[PDB]
């Protein structure tokens, strides 16, 4: 019924909350009791992380109330990350920065369960360019500390991290990312 | 041959077979080829703190700019934990043609305030060249002079990139007396400084130090008293020079200087300490003083 319930939540998104005959938090809370048992199938996690977070109803409480428990039962798949990078699109809707903070915390917390981590690593710059905004730096730094491979240490990224360190503080998250970039091709040095 | 030769060398050294090195009096070393007069003259009257430097793996005297950048970016990063690093081959600080050319490491701070001026030299050190493979460019001597903090940072960088290790070279009072004797045996003129021997008695509660500073010409005439075989100074001749000092000090102050230890032997050739801050190089005998110093660094490495 969850697949039916989540498509109902999508209908709850194709229309307003006011126009709905029933509350979202009632049906999404039945889904939440389900999450206390089993939160989101790979397809379910994908879709409910896709439509609930791109632009639609997805209240910065409601989208967060799900996002606290929107992780995966078996594993998170590539198509989950794909168009939530189009939630990382970060635009007119943007799933505004608080839900972005919980979203990047989602990825940091569940970086261990992806079938193909290489696919997200191939998406390295999409999150690396998200390091410039202040609110996601403490969490994007962790994510790229988890995503970093040698192919992602191009010298322009090294200079961008140095620019971030000079403009912003000596924050230990930037220091951790710098430690990785020193562990790889040493175009930068720091201890 | 590639290692077993070094094992046989270690066997010979540990055997301790009749060591007394009858050494040639440091001959006037006319400055070989280039030896940048400004650079070498800047390198003479500087108090080098000696270290023993194991051979550098995968070193090349072509990639000086790359190492300069790699170390400059490391030193200023140790400040994160204004500075320029100029690796400079010296081109002439070598005893034989096959020795590796000595090269500098200077922490240049705006102007040329050389904070640290490191110095690796391998002169007359062919007891190490013929035992190490080609990949290692061996420079047994390392010369600090900058603060101990910067030395203990560039040494770490060198360990990290070259697998070379810096044991602080400590000249024992035996080697110190040897060099104090061959430097008053030299054929120099216009003695720059008095021949001072800073003794330091081994008293447990107190730490009295003695500066048995002799007039440099007066010590040369005292050396000629105990110098009989020319060309080479023996261990007995060195001991007799030192015992004439002993019998001129215990004669005067009734305290047996031979019961004390040398800590510093200033001479017109080159001052020399014990604890490491050793080699001031007053005169341009530095290819001979450095020859002795490298021969001593082999002793520590090998």
Curated annotation (Swiss-Prot), chain A:
Inducing factors: By follicle-stimulating hormone (FSH).
Taxonomic superkingdom: Eukaryota
Membrane-crossing segments per the record: none
Compartments (UniProt record): Nucleus; Chromosome, Centromere
PTM characteristics: Sumoylated. Sumoylated form can be polyubiquitinated by RNF4, leading to its degradation. Desumoylation by SENP6 prevents its degradation.
Subunit organization: Component of the CENPA-CAD complex, composed of CENPI, CENPK, CENPL, CENPO, CENPP, CENPQ, CENPR and CENPS. The CENPA-CAD complex interacts with the CENPA-NAC complex, at least composed of CENPA, CENPC, CENPH, CENPM, CENPN, CENPT and CENPU. Interacts with SENP6.
Function: Component of the CENPA-CAD (nucleosome distal) complex, a complex recruited to centromeres which is involved in assembly of kinetochore proteins, mitotic progression and chromosome segregation. May be involved in incorporation of newly synthesized CENPA into centromeres via its interaction with the CENPA-NAC complex. Required for the localization of CENPF, MAD1L1 and MAD2 (MAD2L1 or MAD2L2) to kinetochores. Involved in the response of gonadal tissues to follicle-stimulating hormone.
Family to which this protein belongs: Belongs to the CENP-I/CTF3 family.
Stated name of the protein: Centromere protein I
Swiss-Prot record, chain B:
Sites bearing Phosphoserine, chain numbering: 15, 29
Keyword Phosphoprotein included in the entry's annotation: yes
A family per Pfam: CENP-L
Keyword Phosphoprotein tagged: yes
Recorded GO CC terms: cytosol; inner kinetochore; nucleoplasm; nucleus
Keywords: Centromere, Chromosome, Nucleus, Phosphoprotein
Location of Phosphothreonine modifications: 19
Biological processes, Gene Ontology terms: chromosome segregation
Compartments (UniProt record): Nucleus; Chromosome, Centromere
Subunit structure: Component of the CENPA-CAD complex, composed of CENPI, CENPK, CENPL, CENPO, CENPP, CENPQ, CENPR and CENPS. The CENPA-CAD complex interacts with the CENPA-NAC complex, at least composed of CENPA, CENPC, CENPH, CENPM, CENPN, CENPT and CENPU.
UniProt protein name: Centromere protein L
